[PDB]
């Protein structure tokens, strides 16, 4: 449960997560999750989180208030620089 | 703050090299108060514990069809003898009245045309 | 007996070059067999 | 007739198909002696075809050196392209689907489940 370091940046035509070594073949994975289910369930739920996870580190979430701007998909739009250990997604 | 800096930095090294260094460093400077922090007897002991895990996670802040086939084959024969990529015997033709829509990569038959020019170029 | 045996060799190994095998046997015949390839002491 | 370009391209393609087919045979498993010898005899006839096609490919370049300068002249020319393209406007109402230039060579040198002998060698008998 170690919080990695994310580097959000407004693009135009993207998140840059530095990840220490996993030592496994499985690349880091993203998923789009809704705020409807949570450990505390408090009011104001009603937005989406772009969630990132890997076994080495812990899980990280990014709030999305816009309805559509990008596609949170694995094959279409992610890249894994496993050698330098930086993770990509746009 | 010295204490937080030595904690943060020592934690970093022990985070990279593993907790095996925590033991070394602790026993190497056990009498030295500069490393008293490594023992549970110090107040910042709990702070350092977090730093180790944090540096390991790499998150903490470091210090500071014939017609179609024959036109595609014939155009490919005269394209493949080109002296330059855009100085072909077909670039002149498009501008001189000759409607040929498969020259643009927007038409699916371009991918077969590229194979035919590659084959005619192999046949040179 | 040979004509049968020669046809048989090529017949059961049809992926091997017949012309190579024939030319090799001919060359060994002329350069060695006719030229004293059997010697005693 | 485009001896320089089309015929040599077709002969090179036919050779590539023959190599792919006897490679596909050497990739597949064999189970009994009869069918091993049958495929090895089939691959012999394919090699005889390969050697003959390669023969013809080598004896088609003498007049190529005769026309190579005129062929290499891609700037001074263009009218011949137009002349041939104008003749390609002959017989427009030819309502037919033509998917057979590569499919027939590929399905010729291949075989169908009941009989493991390809269409070239389909009457071959051990």
Swiss-Prot record, chain A:
The modification Phosphoserine is found at residue 34. The chain holds residues 114 to 209 of 464 of the full protein. It comes from the Eukaryota. Component of the 17S U2 SnRNP complex, a ribonucleoprotein complex that contains small nuclear RNA (snRNA) U2 and a number of specific proteins. Part of the SF3A subcomplex of the 17S U2 SnRNP complex which is composed of three subunits; SF3A3/SAP61, SF3A2/SAP62 and SF3A1/SAP114. SF3A associates with the splicing factor SF3B and a 12S RNA unit to form the mature 17S U2 small nuclear ribonucleoprotein complex (17S U2 snRNP). Identified in the spliceosome 'E' complex, a precursor of the spliceosome 'A' complex. Identified in the spliceosome 'A' and 'B' complexes. It is found in: Nucleus. Component of the 17S U2 SnRNP complex of the spliceosome, a large ribonucleoprotein complex that removes introns from transcribed pre-mRNAs. The 17S U2 SnRNP complex (1) directly participates in early spliceosome assembly and (2) mediates recognition of the intron branch site during pre-mRNA splicing by promoting the selection of the pre-mRNA branch-site adenosine, the nucleophile for the first step of splicing. Belongs to the SF3A2 family. This is Splicing factor 3A subunit 2. Signal peptide: none annotated.
Swiss-Prot record, chain B:
It comes from the Eukaryota. Ubiquitously expressed. The modification N6-acetyllysine is found at residue 9. It is found in: Nucleus; Nucleus speckle. SURP motif repeats lie at residues 6-48, 71-113. The record marks 74 as: Critical for binding to SF3A3. Component of the 17S U2 SnRNP complex of the spliceosome, a large ribonucleoprotein complex that removes introns from transcribed pre-mRNAs. The 17S U2 SnRNP complex (1) directly participates in early spliceosome assembly and (2) mediates recognition of the intron branch site during pre-mRNA splicing by promoting the selection of the pre-mRNA branch-site adenosine, the nucleophile for the first step of splicing. SURP motif 2 mediates direct binding to SF3A3. Component of the 17S U2 SnRNP complex, a ribonucleoprotein complex that contains small nuclear RNA (snRNA) U2 and a number of specific proteins. Part of the SF3A subcomplex of the 17S U2 SnRNP complex which is composed of three subunits; SF3A3/SAP61, SF3A2/SAP62 and SF3A1/SAP114. SF3A associates with the splicing factor SF3B and a 12S RNA unit to form the mature 17S U2 small nuclear ribonucleoprotein complex (17S U2 snRNP). SF3A1 functions as a scaffold that interacts directly with both SF3A2 and SF3A3. Identified in the spliceosome 'E' complex, a precursor of the spliceosome 'A' complex. This is Splicing factor 3A subunit 1. It comes from Homo sapiens (Human). The gene is SF3A1. The chain holds residues 47 to 219 of 793 of the full protein.
Swiss-Prot record, chain D:
Disulfide bonds: none annotated. The modification N-acetylmethionine is found at residue 1. It comes from the Eukaryota. The modification Phosphoserine is found at residues 54, 121. Ubiquitous. It is found in: Nucleus speckle; Nucleus. Component of the 17S U2 SnRNP complex of the spliceosome, a large ribonucleoprotein complex that removes introns from transcribed pre-mRNAs. The 17S U2 SnRNP complex (1) directly participates in early spliceosome assembly and (2) mediates recognition of the intron branch site during pre-mRNA splicing by promoting the selection of the pre-mRNA branch-site adenosine, the nucleophile for the first step of splicing. Belongs to the SF3A3 family. Component of the 17S U2 SnRNP complex, a ribonucleoprotein complex that contains small nuclear RNA (snRNA) U2 and a number of specific proteins. Part of the SF3A subcomplex of the 17S U2 SnRNP complex which is composed of three subunits; SF3A3/SAP61, SF3A2/SAP62 and SF3A1/SAP114. SF3A associates with the splicing factor SF3B and a 12S RNA unit to form the mature 17S U2 small nuclear ribonucleoprotein complex (17S U2 snRNP). Identified in the spliceosome 'E' complex, a precursor of the spliceosome 'A' complex. Identified in the spliceosome 'A' and 'B' complexes. This is Splicing factor 3A subunit 3. It comes from Homo sapiens (Human). The lineage of its organism: Eukaryota, Metazoa, Chordata, Craniata, Vertebrata. The chain holds residues 1 to 126 of 501 of the full protein.
């Amino acid at each position: 449960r170690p919080g990695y370091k994310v580097t959000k940046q407004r693009d135009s035509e993207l998140f840059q997560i530095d990840y220490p070594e996993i030592a496994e073949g499985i690349m880091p994975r993203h998923r789009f999750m809704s705020a409807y289910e949570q450990r505390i369930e408090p009011p104001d739920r009603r937005w989406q989180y772009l969630l990132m996870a890997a076994e080495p580190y812990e899980t990280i979430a990014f709030k999305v208030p816009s309805r559509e701007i990008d596609k949170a998909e694995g094959k279409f739009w992610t890249h894994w620089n496993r050698e330098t250990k930086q993770f990509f997604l746009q | 703050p010295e204490v937080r800096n030595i904690v943060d930095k020592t934690a970093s090294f022990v985070a990279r090299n593993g907790p095996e260094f925590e033991a070394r460093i602790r026993q190497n400077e056990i009498n030295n108060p500069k490393f008293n922090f490594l023992n549970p007897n110090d107040p910042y002991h709990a702070y350092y514990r977090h730093k180790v895990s944090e540096f390991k996670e790499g998150k903490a802040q470091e210090p500071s069809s014939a017609f179609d086939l024959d036109v595609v084959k014939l155009t490919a024969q005269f394209v493949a003898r080109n002296g330059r990529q855009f100085l072909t015997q077909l670039m002149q033709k498009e501008q001189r009245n000759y409607q040929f829509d498969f020259l643009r990569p927007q038409h699916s038959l371009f991918n077969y045309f590229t194979k035919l020019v590659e084959q005619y170029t192999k046949i040179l | 007996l040979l004509e049968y045996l020669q046809d048989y060799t090529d017949r059961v190994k049809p992926l091997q070059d017949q012309n190579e095998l024939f030319g090799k046997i001919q060359a060994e015949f002329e350069k060695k067999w006719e030229n004293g390839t059997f010697p005693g002491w | 007739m485009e001896t320089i370009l089309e015929q040599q391209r077709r002969y090179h393609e036919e050779k590539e198909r023959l190599m792919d087919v006897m490679a596909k045979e050497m990739l597949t498993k064999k189970s009994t002696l009869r069918d091993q010898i049958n495929s090895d005899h089939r691959t012999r006839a394919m090699q005889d075809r390969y050697m003959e096609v390669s023969g013809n490919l080598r004896d088609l370049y003498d007049d190529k050196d005769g026309l190579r300068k005129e062929e290499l002249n891609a700037i001074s020319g263009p009218n011949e392209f137009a002349e041939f393209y104008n003749r390609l406007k002959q017989i427009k109402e030819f309502h037919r689907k033509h998917p057979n230039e590569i499919c027939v060579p590929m399905s010729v040198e291949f075989e169908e489940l009941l009989k493991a002998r390809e269409n070239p060698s389909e009457e071959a008998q051990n």
